[PDB]
T-cell receptor
């Protein structure tokens, strides 16, 4: 039962040199296998980065910058992916892989690489009231869109006439956008009568130490 | 360029057989390289299913799947296929087809079996017992207005993923933000796509979201009007 171990997450500052390890289980030896490396950015499929067996046997790959390279650590029984001069676009998930004669293609769990220098960014919040169409179907969905924030962690709460709402809220996890910032959405699902029965509804997004609250009012 | 493209049903019921095909263009199927199937559960990592060699048609599968998996080929059509029987929710994933490098690159290397050099874009397969459901598309009408105005479409209560949204038949890309869907306790998905435009544009330009939900064979074009 051979398995590849990768650290689930790694953080490093820009310009640093980092070592991503793919440790083989005790039963197999890293000298005997060519370690392959794959990189995956959000919203796209993985791409072959490189493979390293030894200085004699290795391959770099079309378009892969020389700062990426492969290596091994026989004492730790590990394959290594090395990145020098870390850039912000190097943020990705990194997967290692070997071929085992009896276990076939083995993937590591993947390392999620974070670069630490990025500045804080406040969320921009847009709140939509329900459509007249949906209202005519006796329902009302409030849509709260939250974009361009970093760090990715936010808290979303809803209010009715300034008082806390206790149900009907679904909030997506933060995803990363094309500008390396984070985005999320939160929905308050009501009936048309519940929508009519308050003078204001509000979506309150808490990011870092502060909150930005948007408000809509029926009719 | 040797371009790959996965196809197949986006939704398969439990215990049934998942069936996908990879169409290959720009290059021949036959050759000393492996054609492979790899899958990735949403947010989950990479998992190798199996491969078929280009010139020998021999197969190799993941040992924990050998009883369930069949990888076959169609030389007349230049495409290979994947069949995974008795599926469960554990088989929900994006499925990729891949092609190894040419023999010239592997000089004494072991076949490049685990070398996945070109990838398809991947198709999501949801294994679920719930029925397909098309979306209800509601306008998100812009709002006193600021210098920029946001308008959008709410794509409400569909199953399964995914849904794509364009704006004005693709003529409009700048300022478009389509958000990842929420999944409700009801089992149904909802998402929103907004475009942010200058105030001036509201009196001159029409705005139509184009919603594509392939699993229900539904497309909706909804004009986001101002009221």
């Amino acid at each position: 039962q051979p398995v590849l171990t990768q650290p689930t997450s790694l953080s490093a500052s820009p310009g640093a040199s980092v070592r991503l390890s793919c440790t083989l289980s005790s039963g197999i030896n890293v000298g005997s296998y060519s370690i392959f490396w794959y990189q995956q950015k959000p919203g796209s499929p993985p791409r072959y980065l490189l493979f390293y067996f030894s200085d004699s046997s290795k391959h770099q790959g079309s378009g892969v910058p020389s700062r990426f390279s492969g290596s091994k650590d026989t004492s730790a029984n590990a394959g290594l992916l090395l990145i020098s001069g870390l850039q912000s676009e190097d943020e990705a998930d990194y997967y290692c892989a070997i071929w085992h004669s009896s276990a076939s293609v083995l993937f590591g769990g993947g390392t999620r690489l974070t670069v630490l220098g990025q500045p804080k960014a406040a969320p921009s919040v847009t709140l939509f009231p329900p459509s007249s169409e949906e209202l005519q179907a006796n329902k009302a969905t409030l849509v709260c869109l939250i974009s361009d924030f970093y760090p990715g962690a936010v808290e979303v709460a809803w209010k009715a006439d300034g008082s806390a709402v206790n149900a009907g809220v679904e909030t997506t996890k933060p995803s990363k956008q094309s500008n390396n910032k984070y985005a999320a959405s939160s929905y308050l699902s009501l009936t048309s009568d519940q929508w009519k029965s308050h003078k204001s509804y509000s979506c309150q997004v808490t990011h870092e130490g502060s909150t930005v609250e948007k408000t809509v009012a029926p009719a | 360029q040797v371009q790959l493209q996965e196809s197949g049903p986006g939704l398969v019921k439990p215990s049934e057989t998942l069936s996908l095909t990879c169409d290959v263009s720009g290059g021949s199927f036959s050759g000393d390289f492996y054609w492979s199937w790899i899958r990735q559960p949403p947010g989950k990592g990479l998992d190798w299913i199996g491969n078929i060699h280009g010139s020998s048609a021999g197969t190799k599968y993941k040992p924990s799947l050998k009883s369930r998996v069949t990888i076959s080929k169609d030389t007349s059509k230049n495409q290979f296929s994947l069949k995974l029987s008795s599926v469960t929710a554990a088989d929900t994933a994006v499925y990729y087809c891949t092609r190894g490098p040419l023999s010239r690159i592997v000089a004494g290397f072991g076949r490049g079996i685990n070398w996945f050099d070109v990838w398809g874009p991947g198709v999501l397969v949801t294994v679920s017992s719930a029925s397909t459901k098309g979306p209800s598309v509601f306008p998100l009408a812009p709002s006193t207005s600021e210098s920029t105005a946001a308008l959008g479409c709410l794509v409400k209560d569909y199953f399964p993923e995914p849904v794509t949204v364009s704006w004005n038949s693709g003529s409009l890309t700048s300022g478009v933000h389509t958000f990842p869907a929420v999944l409700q306790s009801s089992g149904l998905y909802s998402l929103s796509s907004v475009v942010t435009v200058p105030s001036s544009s509201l009196g001159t330009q029409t705005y139509v979201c184009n919603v594509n939900h392939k699993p229900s064979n539904t497309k909706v074009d909804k004009r986001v009007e101002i009221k």
